[PDB]
């Protein structure tokens, strides 16, 4: 029409019902002919697929829908792969959080030792799906929000350098939404921003409206008193941005920087017996990964309780920009190679890009200050050592990765944490030499 064929890898997730829903709302600006679900376990996806099946029939029945665990069925004749796989699922996420916490160290999905562990699990999963895409639809793009994006992006850069995969993250979008609310704008798309960093590790340097008016002084005065909370708890993520932002008053921070600049505050935010993976399993998981069972039985929308995930509109914005060559400016994770002049050219950086049908065209950042440089060189080193550990099957390189982390207080605690993660992750990591 032109209409696009899409496969969601990680169909038995609890995000997918929310995004099929969002994909249906965005059908005018991004039309679909085929939507397939891919997962390795049939019975999780089937039960998700039954509710998606109902949605598709209500709003756009002429879309071909199928759920499958067979790679060839899934990845043949698609234009885009939307990947949100979680190797090890929430059970491993729980351990990623809890193991470090036992030692007084930040326990978090993508930051600190929990992030490194998840990274080690994820690399293999993402490479698997990417190879299926290249084997069955060589010209499709993979839009990967499968975390932790910084480590996975470094893996693909090294191990699959020519592949059409874009690693992406919704945090900046979420923060920009709150910025737009603070400024009285109808939408974040009314702002034109400059930004640099690593994934979950960056700064806005310039924010203006379409006319070129500077919005930054207004945002800074607000954020320096309230964080990213619109006018209407010191350690809540968005409130806490106020403390992070004072480290560098000329910019505005990614909220994830709290885990690095105030690690010991964050250690005590999580219940060590009942972490965020447990708050997600009660809140969502069994909530929707079996209100889908009702929607399948009924075979209707109920005035349904599963909300439209309007936060995942950014994945559709990206697919659109590639499909119709819109040239929209978006923050993506790409190989630096000069975008940040005075930073490792081989690093994956999160920077504004003009997105078109050939992929992103990164915009130059120029020279960055010493504060951000130092922080980013340390952190990228953690991510690069983690990928080296994975590719070389090296225990030593992984230990070095933990030693380097700003969240880890010393090399002995680094080793203790590593020995515990090795044990917890035996089914999901490659076997490491020297000497687990
Ligand atoms: N980068 C971002 O901005 C961002 C934002 C939100 C969520 N996420 C990521 O989205 C993913 C999904 O999150 P969720 O909360 O819905 O988790 P989830 O466990 O509900 O979804 C994961 C699904 O992936 C499937 N899966 C796991 N390993 C697989 C494999 N090897 N092959 C095929 N399928 C596999 C699992 O069966 C599960 O159904 C996670 O990686 C999460 O970190 C990323
Ligand atoms: O704890 P959750 O509800 O799973 O949130 C975790 C998610 O937060 C988002 O804002 C980040 O951009 C994702 O990278 C992350 O995976
Ligand atoms: Mn993210």
């Amino acid at each position: 029409k032109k209409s696009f064929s899409i496969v969601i890898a990680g169909g038995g997730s609890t995000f997918t019902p929310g995004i099929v829903l969002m994909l249906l709302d965005h059908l005018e600006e991004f039309p679909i002919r085929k939507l397939k679900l891919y997962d390795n376990d049939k019975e999780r996806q089937d039960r998700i697929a039954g509710a998606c099946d109902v949605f598709i029939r209500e709003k756009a029945p002429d879309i071909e829908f199928a759920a499958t665990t067979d790679p060839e069925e899934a990845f043949t004749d698609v234009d885009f792969v939307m990947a949100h796989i979680r190797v090890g699922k929430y059970a491993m996420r729980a351990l990623d959080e809890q193991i470090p916490l036992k030692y007084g160290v930040v326990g978090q999905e993508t930051c600190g030792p929990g992030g490194i562990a998840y990274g080690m699990r994820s690399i293999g999963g993402v490479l698997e799906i990417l190879d299926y895409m290249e084997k069955y639809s060589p010209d499709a793009w993979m839009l990967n929000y499968s975390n932790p994006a910084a480590i996975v992006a470094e893996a693909t850069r090294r191990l699959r350098p020519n592949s059409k995969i874009l690693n992406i993250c919704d945090m900046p979008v979420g923060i920009e939404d709150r910025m737009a609310q603070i400024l009285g704008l109808s939408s974040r798309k009314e702002m034109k921003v400059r930004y640099y960093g690593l994934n979950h590790f960056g700064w806005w340097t310039s924010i203006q409206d379409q006319e070129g008016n500077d919005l930054m002084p207004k945002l800074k005065e607000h954020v320096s008193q309230y964080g990213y909370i619109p006018k209407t708890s010191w350690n809540d993520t968005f409130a806490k941005a106020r403390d992070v932002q004072a480290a560098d008053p000329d910019t505005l921070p990614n909220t994830y920087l709290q885990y690095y600049l105030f690690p010991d505050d964050m250690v005590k935010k999580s219940n060590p017996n009942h972490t965020r993976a447990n708050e997600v399993m009660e809140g969502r998981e069994a909530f929707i990964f079996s209100q889908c069972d009702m929607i399948t039985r009924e075979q209707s929308s109920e005035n349904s309780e599963i909300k439209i995930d309007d936060h995942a509109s950014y994945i559709v914005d990206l697919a659109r920009a590639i499909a119709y060559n819109t040239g929209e400016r978006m923050l993506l994770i790409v190989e630096n190679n000069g975008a940040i002049a005075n930073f490792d050219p081989t690093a994956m950086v999160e920077v504004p890009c003009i997105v078109g049908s050939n992929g992103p065209e990164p915009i130059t950042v120029g020279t960055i200050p010493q504060f951000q440089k130092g922080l980013m060189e340390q952190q990228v080193s953690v991510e690069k050592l983690t990928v080296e550990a994975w590719a070389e099957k090296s225990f030593q390189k992984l230990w070095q990765a933990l030693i380097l982390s700003k969240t880890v207080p010393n090399a002995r605690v680094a080793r203790l944490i590593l020995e515990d993660l090795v044990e917890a992750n035996k089914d999901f990591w490659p076997e490491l030499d020297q000497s687990p």
Side-chain angles (χ1 to χ4, degrees), residues 13-16 86 90 93 109 276-291 307 309:
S13 182
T14 53
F15 254 39
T16 122
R86 210 196 257 293
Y90 294 137
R93 183 183 176 164
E109 167 194 44
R276 182 61 190 170
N278 304 124
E279 296 185 5
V280 169
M281 275 178 270
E282 236 191 326
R284 287 144 47 211
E285 184 112 298
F287 177 40
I288 75 195
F289 162 57
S290 273
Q291 292 287 182
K307 82 188 199 117
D309 188 7

Side-chain angles (χ1 to χ4, degrees), residues 15 86 90 93 97 108-110 118 145 147-149 168-172 174 199-200 238 255-256 276-277 280 284 311 314:
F15 254 39
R86 210 196 257 293
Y90 294 137
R93 183 183 176 164
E97 279 151 8
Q108 207 276 322
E109 167 194 44
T110 64
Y118 186 28
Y145 34 32
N147 265 329
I168 53 174
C169 170
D170 65 3
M171 193 48 90
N199 177 240
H200 291 196
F238 299 104
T255 46
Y256 278 110
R276 182 61 190 170
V280 169
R284 287 144 47 211
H311 200 188
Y314 78 87

Side-chain angles (χ1 to χ4, degrees), residues 4 11 81 123 168-169 213 256 260 267 269 321 333 335 396:
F4 296 98
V81 176
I123 288 158
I168 53 174
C169 170
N213 300 304
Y256 278 110
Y260 299 95
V267 161
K269 211 230 281 128
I333 297 154
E335 190 182 57
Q396 187 70 40

Side-chain angles (χ1 to χ4, degrees), residues 184-435:
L185 302 182
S186 277
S187 160
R188 52 173 288 270
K189 277 139 185 241
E190 301 180 30
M191 317 188 297
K192 174 186 179 167
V193 314
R194 290 166 68 76
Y195 178 102
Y196 66 86
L198 315 171
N199 177 240
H200 291 196
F201 211 93
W203 297 263
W204 285 267
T205 60
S206 150
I207 304 188
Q208 59 188 40
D209 62 17
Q210 292 295 317
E211 276 204 308
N213 300 304
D214 192 356
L215 305 177
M216 202 153 78
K218 275 194 284 180
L219 270 178
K220 282 175 172 167
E221 188 69 66
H222 182 86
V223 172
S224 73
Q225 312 168 49
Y226 306 114
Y228 294 126
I229 297 172
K231 270 276 93 268
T232 11
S233 236
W234 80 288
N235 235 26
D236 170 69
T237 292
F238 299 104
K240 184 68 157 160
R242 97 178 121 184
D243 292 347
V244 180
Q245 195 273 334
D248 182 44
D250 301 337
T251 58
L252 293 174
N254 195 304
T255 46
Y256 278 110
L257 286 167
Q258 76 187 346
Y259 298 102
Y260 299 95
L261 298 202
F262 301 98
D264 43 287
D265 293 353
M266 302 299 104
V267 161
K268 312 172 164 117
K269 211 230 281 128
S270 28
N271 190 338
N273 201 297
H274 194 269
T275 57
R276 182 61 190 170
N278 304 124
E279 296 185 5
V280 169
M281 275 178 270
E282 236 191 326
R284 287 144 47 211
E285 184 112 298
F287 177 40
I288 75 195
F289 162 57
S290 273
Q291 292 287 182
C292 292
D293 284 21
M294 159 198 59
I295 295 293
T296 306
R297 235 152 95 73
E298 228 107 47
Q299 206 98 148
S300 167
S301 279
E302 134 203 0
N303 233 314
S304 192
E305 90 266 69
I306 292 165
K307 82 188 199 117
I308 64 197
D309 188 7
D310 228 90
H311 200 188
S313 51
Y314 78 87
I315 16 285
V316 124
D317 287 347
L318 175 59
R320 253 187 55 76
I322 292 154
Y324 303 125
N325 194 44
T326 68
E328 199 173 299
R329 180 194 291 225
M330 325 194 182
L331 302 182
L332 299 176
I333 297 154
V334 293
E335 190 182 57
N336 182 20
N337 204 29
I340 311 183
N342 64 325
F343 188 69
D344 191 343
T346 71
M348 298 303 266
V349 292
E350 183 156 80
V351 302
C353 306
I354 305 298
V355 181
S357 58
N358 289 319
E361 293 180 287
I363 299 173
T364 56
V365 176
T367 297
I368 59 162
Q370 198 64 228
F371 181 57
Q372 280 89 346
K373 180 174 159 62
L375 290 171
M376 289 170 73
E377 289 283 356
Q378 173 186 11
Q379 186 53 26
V380 80
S381 284
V382 173
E383 297 157 358
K384 288 172 156 313
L385 288 162
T386 299
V387 173
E388 287 176 13
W390 190 95
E392 297 166 23
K393 299 182 187 72
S394 174
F395 174 103
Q396 187 70 40
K397 295 281 182 82
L398 205 45
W399 184 20
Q400 292 178 333
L402 295 151
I403 295 164
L404 248 64
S405 185
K406 196 164 184 67
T407 63
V408 173
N410 65 71
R412 186 172 53 254
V413 175
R415 197 164 173 155
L416 294 168
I417 289 174
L418 181 52
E419 273 156 14
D420 288 345
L421 294 167
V422 160
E423 195 49 45
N425 285 271
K426 259 304 204 91
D427 304 316
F428 299 104
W429 288 8
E431 199 168 296
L432 305 187
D433 110 88
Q434 291 242 139
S435 218

